[PDB]
Enzyme design. Structure first.
Site, PDB file in Angstrom:
ATOM      1  N   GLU A 186     -13.825   2.210 -18.659  1.00  0.00           N
ATOM      2  CA  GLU A 186     -13.244   0.904 -18.947  1.00  0.00           C
ATOM      3  C   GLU A 186     -14.286  -0.031 -19.575  1.00  0.00           C
ATOM      4  O   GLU A 186     -15.396  -0.191 -19.035  1.00  0.00           O
ATOM      5  CB  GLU A 186     -12.729   0.275 -17.653  1.00  0.00           C
ATOM      6  CG  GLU A 186     -11.697   1.106 -16.892  1.00  0.00           C
ATOM      7  CD  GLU A 186     -10.310   1.034 -17.504  1.00  0.00           C
ATOM      8  OE1 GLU A 186     -10.078   0.156 -18.365  1.00  0.00           O
ATOM      9  OE2 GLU A 186      -9.445   1.854 -17.116  1.00  0.00           O
TER      10      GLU A 186
ATOM     11  N   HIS B 160      -3.626   3.366 -24.655  1.00  0.00           N
ATOM     12  CA  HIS B 160      -3.084   2.013 -24.698  1.00  0.00           C
ATOM     13  C   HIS B 160      -3.556   1.420 -26.001  1.00  0.00           C
ATOM     14  O   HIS B 160      -4.747   1.194 -26.187  1.00  0.00           O
ATOM     15  CB  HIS B 160      -3.572   1.207 -23.498  1.00  0.00           C
ATOM     16  CG  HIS B 160      -3.113   1.754 -22.165  1.00  0.00           C
ATOM     17  ND1 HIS B 160      -3.909   1.795 -21.080  1.00  0.00           N
ATOM     18  CD2 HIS B 160      -1.882   2.263 -21.764  1.00  0.00           C
ATOM     19  CE1 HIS B 160      -3.228   2.305 -20.037  1.00  0.00           C
ATOM     20  NE2 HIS B 160      -1.990   2.589 -20.451  1.00  0.00           N
TER      21      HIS B 160
HETATM   22 ZN   LIG Z   1      -5.966   1.412 -20.859  1.00  0.00          ZN
END
Ligand SMILES: [Zn+2]
Length: 380
Positions: free
Chosen positions: A341, A168
């Protein structure tokens, strides 16, 4: 006269109104070929010593509106040093209220990581005796998909450790993390003298993709490549036209083999550093449980930023979970496989009002995770 511009690496903004500093109206532009909207990055000039009130009118229509709750934007006079600025959100619009100290300033969703920076870093890293860089293929727009390998000769097969980042493209924290990790493997800076890398090379060979989405990055996208594909949904059936980034990397992982897998992301909503493991997989064995728990324990020791209290609520397994890299790899290879994350906001357990979560904290996390990898391979 105020001027807002955005034509540069990762630039993104739509200007609605910009002729009074106290009434600047903006929209988050959105991904180039996708409805997902969240990333922003723009330059503002002509506002030295003037209080600027910049309202993002479509804040509530963004991909993750909770990403604006308890969130402050980042700013920089030179693209080098970034700091947090006063920001409010009421569930409808977001407003930055800031008085630039100099003639030209940038505001962004997170500390950027530019294509230039990537090229300078990899161009230096490839010069280490233990390094190689291989072009696996091309992005949609003809940029290289580059694999960095770090290792020494096998005299006993070494474990293959895979780290991929920034599927991303707006999650620039992911590339900062890789930079900190690689710098430690290089023995550069304060890492000169540290024995962790040396010990690691005796047991492990690293295969690293610092930027999984070169096109999306420069486009100013959050979640998609230049063709509008969410790369972390392409793992069960990647395509040469739609998702060549994943097609090339998935092929290399299969060709090379995989003992440990880490997919590096940023999370919009949660102000915590956490992992999503493979425990929801029907293929998740007792030994895998033992191994995942023990790595997580080691990572908790290596980094005070890392925690397990907060995270994604683990819902029921569905077959389409395999579209995600860490699940695909976990299911396919049966190895330790994690999504990591980092927050766009801050680490709420250890907040920093000046910088929030940033490049230097992401990089420190990457360096810390190496120490957990060492502990882990020395145990298993
Ligand atoms: Zn991501």
């Amino acid at each position: 006269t105020l001027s807002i511009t955005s034509n540069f690496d990762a630039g993104a903004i739509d200007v609605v109104s910009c002729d009074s500093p106290d009434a600047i109206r903006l929209r988050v532009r959105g991904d180039n070929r996708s409805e997902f909207a969240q990333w922003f990055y723009y330059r503002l000039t002509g506002a030295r010593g003037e209080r600027c009130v910049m309202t993002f009118e479509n804040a509530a229509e963004c991909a993750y509106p909770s990403g604006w709750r308890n969130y402050s934007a980042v700013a920089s006079y030179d693209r080098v040093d970034w700091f947090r600025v006063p920001t409010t959100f009421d569930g409808k619009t977001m407003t930055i209220d800031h008085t630039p100290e100099f003639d030209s300033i940038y505001y962004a969703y997170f500390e950027p990581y530019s294509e230039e920076r990537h090229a300078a870093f990899l161009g230096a890293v490839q010069q280490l005796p233990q390094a190689s860089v291989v072009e696996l293929g091309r992005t949609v727009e003809g940029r290289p998909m580059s694999l960095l390998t770090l290792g020494t000769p096998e005299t006993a097969p070494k474990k293959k450790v895979w780290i991929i980042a920034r599927q991303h493209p707006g999650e620039s924290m992911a590339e900062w993390f890789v930079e900190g990790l690689v710098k430690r493997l290089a023995g550069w800076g304060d890492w000169a003298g540290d024995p962790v890398a040396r010990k690691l090379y005796d047991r492990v060979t690293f295969h690293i993709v610092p930027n999984m989405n070169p096109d999306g990055s420069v486009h100013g996208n959050l979640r998609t490549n230049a063709a509008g594909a969410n790369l972390n949904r392409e793992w069960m059936a990647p395509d040469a036209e739609r998702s060549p980034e994943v097609l090339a990397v998935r092929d290399a992982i299969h060709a090379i083999g995989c003992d440990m897998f880490f997919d590096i992301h940023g999370d919009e909503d949660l102000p915590y550093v956490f992992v999503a493991g493979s425990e929801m997989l029907p293929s998740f064995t007792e030994q895998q449980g033992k191994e995942q728990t023990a790595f997580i324990e080691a990572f908790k020791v290596a980094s005070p930023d890392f925690q397990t209290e907060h995270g994604y609520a683990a819902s029921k397994y569905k077959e389409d979970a395999l579209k995600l890299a860490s699940k695909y790899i976990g299911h396919q290879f049966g190895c330790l496989s994690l999504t990591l994350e980092m927050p766009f906001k801050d680490n709420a357990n250890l907040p920093d009002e000046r910088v929030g979560w940033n490049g230097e904290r992401s990089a420190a996390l990457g360096a810390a995770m190496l120490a957990a990898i060492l502990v882990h391979v020395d145990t298993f």
